[PDB]
């Protein structure tokens, strides 16, 4: 008995149409399931179907059991950021005989990136005092179609882009961070190894 | 909730055992199972055990397992040898696998160490908003760096005037390796807190980046001279600069 969810990753904008493929290779009349795993938590049940054309639904997701192409594809009309998770297809025996087991797919990572309506790319330099030998550079307020590359330099550390939402003001921003325990580190070299927008703003520090 | 497991997390030195507990707090689903989760994030069924006193044995890539249904509301897992980290999920159901469905508990995360004197707690640093960001955007991005920990089990949190904040925050999904390739590498982690500039500019306002490091237990074989890298909270803090 086998389950395939062909795709390892899926990246999507807020409000994009989603479909995740689930095909099985079984020799009974197997029951099928969807589970979701959010970061930090254990899997959570979504729904079950066991007969051809039975449709299962929860939280704006839907799937329909399709005996002809042996499929239980997961679908959602409009994904939002909070749907970022790992979706697991599984199958087992409805019968009570037995093993007691579910077979799980490899699972599919869903990353929903937000729609940044007022881009404003900038790299800024901050500072400490209280320890670090260091200085960090903050690349922020870019578009979701920017990718942040890991460094060519091994003494430099660069994080992947990451979204923060200030509720209260309906604002979402991407940010990535760069730092180095050394000299030779200015904020206009920081993200050299990423393709950044032509119009990225590099303001200077201090005063006169 | 309807299943409580213990321990929640555990450090285990290579080729050594640990006992796991799961208790079922509702007989509407009186089948219990064990499921492991790989570090490649695969879910594999280990056991389903219905009736008190039945025991089952299994050997997998990375661990040997003894499963035991002691009572109608107690499942136990012994996990021996164990070269690879995993999460172990207890699950209950109204039947079988298929007949009705599985409901996963909170899990036990088991981290494996080949040695024990690679273990280090994080250094934590806070970085205050740039003056240029404040003037371009009238927003203020603090950054927090957790550097030099091993192994990778840190939870990071922002606290503003004593209260835990969630809004405006973005922590890296997983940490990254400082000595990238080096099977006992140390990790760094990054997080971001963004408030309006006027929020930062108030010197009443207090900001703490806080890291919970899970490391060496109650007592463990600490032959070294340096301080014991126990479970602990390392913090760094800044004040609002009306500047």
Numbering used by the authors:
A (entry chain A): 1 to 208
B (entry chain B): 1 to 243
Provide excerpts from the study:
To understand the structural features that contribute to CD8 T cell elite control, we focused on a strongly protective CD8 T cell response directed against a parasite-derived peptide (HF10) presented by an atypical MHC-I molecule, H-2Ld. The potent T cell response to the intracellular protozoan parasite, Toxoplasma gondii in resistant (H2d) mouse strains is dominated by CD8 T cells specific for a single peptide, HF10, (derived from the parasite protein GRA6) presented by Ld. Here we show that the Ld-HF10-specific T cell response displays a focused TCR repertoire dominated by Vβ2. Thus, this example of T cell elite control uses a strategy in which both TCR and MHC contribute substantially to peptide specificity and expands the prevailing view of T cell germline recognition.
